[PDB]
Design a protein around this motif. Structure first.
Motif, PDB file in Angstrom:
ATOM      1  N   UNK B  55       6.410   6.267  -7.116  1.00  0.00           N
ATOM      2  CA  UNK B  55       6.974   4.929  -7.048  1.00  0.00           C
ATOM      3  C   UNK B  55       5.927   3.886  -6.667  1.00  0.00           C
ATOM      4  N   UNK B  56       4.892   4.307  -5.949  1.00  0.00           N
ATOM      5  CA  UNK B  56       3.810   3.397  -5.576  1.00  0.00           C
ATOM      6  C   UNK B  56       3.117   2.981  -6.866  1.00  0.00           C
ATOM      7  N   UNK B  57       2.853   3.957  -7.731  1.00  0.00           N
ATOM      8  CA  UNK B  57       2.201   3.673  -9.001  1.00  0.00           C
ATOM      9  C   UNK B  57       3.089   2.801  -9.883  1.00  0.00           C
ATOM     10  N   UNK B  58       4.406   3.004  -9.810  1.00  0.00           N
ATOM     11  CA  UNK B  58       5.354   2.220 -10.613  1.00  0.00           C
ATOM     12  C   UNK B  58       5.304   0.755 -10.212  1.00  0.00           C
ATOM     13  N   UNK B 181       1.915   0.757   0.993  1.00  0.00           N
ATOM     14  CA  UNK B 181       2.427   0.736  -0.382  1.00  0.00           C
ATOM     15  C   UNK B 181       2.340  -0.627  -1.047  1.00  0.00           C
ATOM     16  N   UNK B 182       2.804  -1.659  -0.337  1.00  0.00           N
ATOM     17  CA  UNK B 182       2.806  -3.036  -0.843  1.00  0.00           C
ATOM     18  C   UNK B 182       1.420  -3.673  -0.895  1.00  0.00           C
ATOM     19  N   UNK B 183       0.610  -3.439   0.134  1.00  0.00           N
ATOM     20  CA  UNK B 183      -0.751  -3.974   0.180  1.00  0.00           C
ATOM     21  C   UNK B 183      -1.496  -3.430  -1.039  1.00  0.00           C
ATOM     22  N   UNK B 184      -1.446  -2.118  -1.197  1.00  0.00           N
ATOM     23  CA  UNK B 184      -2.091  -1.443  -2.303  1.00  0.00           C
ATOM     24  C   UNK B 184      -1.706  -2.059  -3.641  1.00  0.00           C
ATOM     25  N   UNK B 185      -0.431  -2.413  -3.773  1.00  0.00           N
ATOM     26  CA  UNK B 185       0.079  -2.988  -5.013  1.00  0.00           C
ATOM     27  C   UNK B 185      -0.470  -4.377  -5.327  1.00  0.00           C
ATOM     28  N   UNK B 190      -3.740  -7.222  -9.336  1.00  0.00           N
ATOM     29  CA  UNK B 190      -4.744  -8.174  -9.797  1.00  0.00           C
ATOM     30  C   UNK B 190      -5.926  -7.500 -10.470  1.00  0.00           C
ATOM     31  N   UNK B 191      -6.508  -6.491  -9.819  1.00  0.00           N
ATOM     32  CA  UNK B 191      -7.678  -5.794 -10.370  1.00  0.00           C
ATOM     33  C   UNK B 191      -7.400  -5.037 -11.663  1.00  0.00           C
ATOM     34  N   UNK B 192      -6.342  -4.232 -11.667  1.00  0.00           N
ATOM     35  CA  UNK B 192      -5.975  -3.467 -12.854  1.00  0.00           C
ATOM     36  C   UNK B 192      -5.734  -4.433 -14.018  1.00  0.00           C
ATOM     37  N   UNK B 221      -7.430   3.046   2.108  1.00  0.00           N
ATOM     38  CA  UNK B 221      -8.470   3.404   1.153  1.00  0.00           C
ATOM     39  C   UNK B 221      -7.988   4.510   0.234  1.00  0.00           C
ATOM     40  N   UNK B 222      -7.291   5.483   0.815  1.00  0.00           N
ATOM     41  CA  UNK B 222      -6.776   6.623   0.062  1.00  0.00           C
ATOM     42  C   UNK B 222      -5.613   6.253  -0.850  1.00  0.00           C
ATOM     43  N   UNK B 223      -4.709   5.417  -0.351  1.00  0.00           N
ATOM     44  CA  UNK B 223      -3.562   4.978  -1.133  1.00  0.00           C
ATOM     45  C   UNK B 223      -4.070   4.317  -2.405  1.00  0.00           C
TER      46      UNK B 223
END
Lengths: 440, 440
Positions: B55-58, B181-185, B190-192, B221-223
């Motif tokens: 779901x993080x990837x979603x 989860x949200x920070x990572x997103x 933006x980058x992706x 970093x891992x997320x």
């Protein structure tokens, strides 16, 4: 404190908010300085962390104060200011009899009721079936009626517990409605705002109830009792059965007739009588109008028997701009449905259970309720002569009598009624109307 | 699914959302059908329940797609499209050298950077110190620069990861920003969206970092590494030190000079060189420009030594509407501060520790950062010749050289600088610039 984010965060981290912070937040909600996103977050935080008794009381008190709070000292009404509230159900017409009865016994009831929510019906909607009935008198008028008649059933104004409008509206679409702390607050913000001395809660239990299980009902009942008493209002609550329509009818005008017939002694559903008497007993005691339970019941039975209760009801209807001869000619004013036909079961047997929620929704769909605020209700549609659990059904005994506005409306409603009532071969075990009493 | 409340509720009850639901919600946020209150509730739910890798990837994928996603296939750039990102810090001018260096090595960098957030500085702000520099070229222009020069540093457009604007804005005032989860997103949306092949993350650690402790830095970093790779982008991340200003200066124009001097070989802060080289090595490898770490370092060192990197930097500045002779006459364009005086410690000793956040805030207050979006920045103010941990300080060695716009501005900044740097008698234990590398 003075920072919404910080307060949302404090609670988010499991910290108990202070009165000063709650007050701030609520005042902010009312003042429109607090945003919708911020109301949603705190609410979701109170969900995940609940609230302690002191902060629960702070919330209710804060919401109560975000607007007008009635004061009855000016009128010098030498009699208690008591009122009742219910978590709602179907066929729950208790307020229309309870009001006049208690008033006839020396109490004063500034009942600020409401409208139908979801599957449950709303007293105000039932009353608005009465030609000319006004649920919004000016405060000066409200006071006069309460002084002269002793009871009035009006709708909530924008000035009453303002913060709650913004709050509920938000939690309604953010999945933060089922939260004892918050539910308790909405309920009490409005009732406490009436400047009561005593209050009795009717917390429903069952398939037609709001709370899912008996535990949740009991819990909510307790939260309310503690908090209401914590705020200084003598409060008691009763767990009532809502596993089947309480009154014999379900609708707006159909339920008003039933109230009048109840008050006039023509007909009194036994369960409805129990629940109604019970809530009144609590009010006479808490209001100090009677000390002994048996003394409460005696006085109430008296007002029912001598017609005083019925008389107070008519005086109320008139006082709120309704007909001067309603309890006498209620038939001449209450709208009748186009089509009135009974629905019978596809088989014989005993009524073992009925999805009261479904029955609630069936009336809404018939047009007797609102799926949306903008909806107009048909005051004529509804069910009458509801079969009760344990009733043997056959071709000479219908499941209910449907008052529909047209054949298609009837056919559909009948389908719903037949699907919500489950028949069995053996009679079901009788469940109590009133489960228990709660107080602090 | 198709109901916000239901989706907020599903997650609220600890249930993992499906791609179809996430996509729905995000599209709704972008489409403005989802309300602020509803963005706040879900976010607070993702906080309390976190999210699974799928779901993080979603979420990231969904946010990335809510707007434009660059495609570099049309240009047929026979070279990797790589980019770097940092969680921010003070004196973190790595991007101004890293860009040109990597580009000189055959890479392509569509760097969509940002502005200063809180105590950290923003590359775009530093670059806008350059007279005429444009951080918003038309897409057609952006493409030309990336094709001709190999690197461009622009600001984010409304079309880039739209959902994130609405989302972050909300969680910013609802206490739902600190959530891996949200920070990572936000970071990845933006980058992706730049249509990358490889990416390297600079996750800061320390008092000037975003994440509170080394564990949280490592986790984030891992997320990011898992999710970025999960979305198909070769991603690696390095934990970097931010327990003191990375570069020798902190500000906008002061840091641009330092970059040019770095690129020209006049001066190279040792820590900044380490971190900068490290991030570039990762990019050369992931981008397949070099296979061996030693081969990466060799190529990069080469571009620094032969001036190719400096040349690419000037070509970039010119290409983005800046001066044609910047690396040559940078002094003629970069605004100088009114008052430039050094601040000395009240005592002698070794610099044992410094509250980098405080130093970050000191530049903002001097006017080199924004406390609010509407704020204008003074591109001249800042610190220079920053003392490093382990440095012996005395009257012949200042804590830093302050470029203030007026005496009162200097006095105040000096006070802050002296209070953020702690002196000791014995030299502190040297901590590593680069803690560790992470990949999947």
């Amino acid at each position: 404190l003075f920072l919404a984010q910080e307060i949302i965060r404090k609670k988010r981290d499991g910290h108990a908010l202070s009165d000063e912070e709650i007050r701030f937040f609520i005042n902010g909600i009312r003042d429109n300085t607090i945003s919708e996103g911020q109301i949603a977050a705190l609410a979701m935080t109170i969900f995940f962390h609940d609230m302690t008794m002191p902060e629960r009381v702070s919330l209710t008190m804060a919401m109560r104060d975000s607007g007008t709070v009635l004061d009855w000292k000016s009128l010098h009404l030498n009699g208690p200011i008591v009122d009742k509230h219910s978590t709602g159900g179907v066929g729950d017409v208790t307020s229309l009899m309870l009001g006049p009865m208690v008033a006839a016994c020396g109490g004063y009831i500034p009942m600020i009721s409401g409208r139908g929510l979801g599957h449950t019906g709303g007293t105000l909607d039932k009353l608005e079936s009465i030609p000319g009935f006004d649920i919004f008198p000016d405060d000066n008028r409200f006071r006069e009626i309460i002084k002269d008649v002793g009871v009035a059933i009006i709708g909530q104004t924008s000035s009453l517990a303002p913060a709650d409008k913004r709050f509920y509206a938000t939690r309604d679409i953010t999945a933060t409605v089922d939260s004892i702390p918050l539910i308790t607050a909405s309920i009490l913000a409005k009732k406490l705002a009436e400047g009561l001395d005593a209050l009795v809660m009717d917390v429903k239990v069952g398939s037609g109830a709001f709370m899912p299980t008996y535990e949740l009902s009991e819990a909510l009942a307790e939260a309310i009792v503690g908090v209401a008493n914590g705020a200084g209002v003598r409060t008691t609550a009763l767990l009532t059965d809502m596993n089947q329509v309480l009154a014999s009818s379900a609708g707006n005008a159909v339920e008003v007739r039933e109230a009048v017939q109840f008050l006039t002694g023509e007909y009194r559903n036994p369960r409805l009588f129990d629940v109604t008497m019970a809530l009144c007993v609590e009010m006479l005691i808490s209001g100090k109008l009677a000390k002994d339970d048996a003394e409460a019941r005696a006085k109430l039975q008296a007002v029912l028997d001598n017609g005083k209760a019925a008389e107070v009801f008519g005086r109320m209807v008139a006082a709120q701009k309704g007909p001067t001869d309603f309890v006498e000619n209620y038939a001449k004013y209450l709208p009748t449905a186009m089509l009135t036909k009974a629905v019978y079961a596809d088989t014989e047997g005993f009524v073992s259970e009925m999805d009261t929620r479904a029955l609630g929704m069936a009336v809404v769909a018939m047009g007797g309720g609102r799926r949306q605020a903008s909806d107009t209700i048909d005051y004529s549609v509804g069910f009458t002569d509801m079969a009760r659990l344990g009733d043997q059904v056959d071709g000479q005994r219908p499941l209910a009598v449907i008052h529909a506005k047209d054949e298609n409306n009837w056919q559909e409603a009948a389908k719903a009624v037949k699907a919500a009532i489950k028949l069995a071969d053996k009679a079901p075990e009788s469940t109590p109307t009133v489960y228990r009493r709660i107080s602090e």
